[PDB]
Amino acid sequence: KKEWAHVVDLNHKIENFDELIPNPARSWPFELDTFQKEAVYHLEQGDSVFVAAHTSAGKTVVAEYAIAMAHRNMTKTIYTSPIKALSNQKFRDFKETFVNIGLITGDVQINPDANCLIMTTEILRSMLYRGADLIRDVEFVIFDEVHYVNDQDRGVVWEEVIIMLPQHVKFILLSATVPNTYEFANWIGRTKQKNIYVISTPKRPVPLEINIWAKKELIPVINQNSEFLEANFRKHKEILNDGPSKKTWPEIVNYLRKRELLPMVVFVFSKKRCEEYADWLEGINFCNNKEKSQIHMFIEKSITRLKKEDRDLPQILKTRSLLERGIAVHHGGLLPIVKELIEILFSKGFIKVLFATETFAMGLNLPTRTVIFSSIRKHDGNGLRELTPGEFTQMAGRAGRRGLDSTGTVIVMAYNSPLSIATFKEVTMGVPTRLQSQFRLTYNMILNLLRIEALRVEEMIKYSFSENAKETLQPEHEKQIKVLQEELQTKFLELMLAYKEATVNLMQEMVKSPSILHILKEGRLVAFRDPNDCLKLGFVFKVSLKDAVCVIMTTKPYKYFPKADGYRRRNFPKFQKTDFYMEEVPVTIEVITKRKFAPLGKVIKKDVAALNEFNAETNNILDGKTLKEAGLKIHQILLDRTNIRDESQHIVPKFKAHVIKKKIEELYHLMSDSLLPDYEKRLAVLKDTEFIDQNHNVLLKGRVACEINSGYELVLTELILDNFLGSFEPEEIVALLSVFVYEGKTREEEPPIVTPRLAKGKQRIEEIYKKMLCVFNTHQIPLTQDEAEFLDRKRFAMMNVVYEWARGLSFKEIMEMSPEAEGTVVRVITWLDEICREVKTASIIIGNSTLHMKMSRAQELIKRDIVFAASLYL
Ligand SMILES: Nc1ncnc2c1ncn2[C@@H]1O[C@H](COP(=O)(O)OP(=O)(O)NP(=O)(O)O)[C@@H](O)[C@H]1O
């Protein structure tokens, strides 16, 4: 009866809305869309909202409203998103929109006494665990980019956060259009006992047009009404009938320029190729003198902080070169400050051509007039594969600027060969991506909750999305089993069914080895099952292993077993005949008879001769005899089958009962398997390695691990627990620690480790990790590919860089010896600061003040220059 999540009908309207709101906490130059009105309304009622709105609709408006309320009730509104890189920006967007707002990061903290705070989800979780005091004064928590999914991002923890939030906190979840919003809104509302209204939109306010660029021509293939244009696509194919060349970009750039479809963002899934393509625009310029000067001034003003040695970095000079001509690239290889320059200049209208990797499309709020896909295929750790509809929608959706563009232009590049239609339709018009739960158990979480209170973990698991999902399913499967249990209420089968499965198995097995084409030579009379599973007989005519389908000349369906005379007589009487037809049949054929027909093609023509022959043969085959049958896998399979072997109008019921048993048995397991198993395993793991004792008390070791929130808490704890690091220099320690924050995917050969101790340290960590893996294996706990291949990658490749950096080398010299691009160097080194902080705290717990001192020293050594430059957004 009681519902906590309420779906707001799209057909619903608020004509008297302007009257319902007496004193709107905020107003805008424009007129709010119905969904925004819904949002504001339900917010003012004192309820929660889950807004899943198309790209270009204006979700931020709901965020600003909320905030406003916080400034009207002396309450606090915390804004959160999983994307840390986008904290500084959002913090600047609100400052320029509203007026005290703060910013909470790991090291930097600005204006905490504000009625609004910007922070990542992790920081919020952290504050929750901490039990911060300001949370008692928080009324609204905004969860932005709820649809954000990233496997390599450990900060997507809004579920844990929502579970942990106190009862007096109301929610505002912002998301792209997803199909399963109600699920999560219902979990939230039910689990939190909160009225939450699910709000969405019918379509994109700024409609997209999807085009293909082929042979210097722009061809529409999906119109504003999302209709696929077959003729045009075929046209592209025909025109063409294989990647960017030197003339590619100048040509399309020039084409779009004459037609004023700029600025353009070109998505390129490769940093190198971004830069290459950008370089291919040599001699093209979009900036007049004043613009060049403004840009120069902005850059000069922005980097004046840095030392001269950093201002003159090659990447900076090259970037300036591009920027002063209205061109840029955007990718993870760039120094943050450079990224920021590019972003700020792009948002202000100084950049007309931007080549960007996928990241640019996710967080950043920088829409463009035109979006181009250099390719709709991207390589992920798995390899090369087509983009998913969600990704394509995410990138393509950037192409419409509400208020500036009538429409958003999206272009897919074709080069020398046509794009496949299935691929293209799957990528551009595939089923929209669903919200998935990101909630996982970690040792850190378990140790912390366990340290807090005995059954906190169980409680956390009870209130998770998975559990609630299981709860939602339970009754459904109950009714299904009720119908089945009642439906039924109103050895032969085992061996037989097994025999069927065995024959199917063997058949599937024979479909791999070409040798089959010898057994299924044109004319091989066989008894097979049609789609309706009716036994029939026919001669083989074609064998396409590529499609694994055989064309047969067919005996009407019979609505046996090799060498089963009596069994045949009793079970299988004479079959019926029917005009021969060519039927396509799947290999997975109940029996391959010894009978072979001497050309069918002549029977297909109905030549009197072949006709008579066929008639006689068929009549003969259908008249008398009973069917006779006739690698290493097929051998064993056949053996087992024969073992089972040695082992008409009445089998219907039994068969039905079997079907039932299968269904029910199936619906049973469907309620068996999920966090509790993992949890038990993890407890076992923590018990074996002594983070907790036999009674599940958290030991000192576990209290140390509680402080490491970076991913490899157990191994790191193990590393720092004793005094192996006793004779290491701060530089050496921070150098060695880089292994826990570097993917180690460099495609270059590792040079000699710069010091002996570092080599020893690598050895030590490797050993620790091996042991830990052994323990993971013992308790059959599933590993992520990273955990698994950890040692198979070059994770230690950054030790030298970090060492030399801690020694005082300039970034220039650092880069001259780095196996990774600037951005990654900065990523590693900036993460190491946090690592050092964690280790400091840990050392406090351990009582090792020397280690503490060293870590402080390391922080002091690495925390400098362009690597730690203040954000341009602040
Ligand atoms: N009701 C409105 N009428 C006219 N303009 C609006 C309206 N609402 C928002 N805008 C403007 O259009 C833009 C809205 O974009 P935004 O706030 O980021 O939502 P969004 O497009 O859905 N973000 P995202 O989906 O992640 O890409 C802002 O620049 C607003 O100024």
Side-chain angles (χ1 to χ4, degrees), residues 30 32-33 36 54-61 398 402:
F30 48 79
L32 303 175
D33 288 15
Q36 307 174 257
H54 287 86
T55 306
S56 76
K59 287 183 283 280
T60 306
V61 172
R398 314 302 313 136
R402 179 164 195 174

Side-chain angles (χ1 to χ4, degrees), residues 28 30 32-36 53-61 64 90 144-145 147 175-176 204 361-365 367 394 397-398 400-403:
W28 291 262
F30 48 79
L32 303 175
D33 288 15
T34 58
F35 89 93
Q36 307 174 257
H54 287 86
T55 306
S56 76
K59 287 183 283 280
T60 306
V61 172
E64 289 173 2
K90 298 302 297 192
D144 200 9
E145 312 296 88
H147 66 289
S175 169
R204 288 177 45 102
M362 168 37 74
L364 285 46
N365 51 24
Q394 184 57 63
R398 314 302 313 136
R401 298 174 307 179
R402 179 164 195 174

Side-chain angles (χ1 to χ4, degrees), residues 129 199 666 768 828 832 854 863:
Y129 276 78
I199 303 177
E666 184 174 4
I768 298 172
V828 172
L832 279 171
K854 295 193 192 179
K863 201 157 162 62

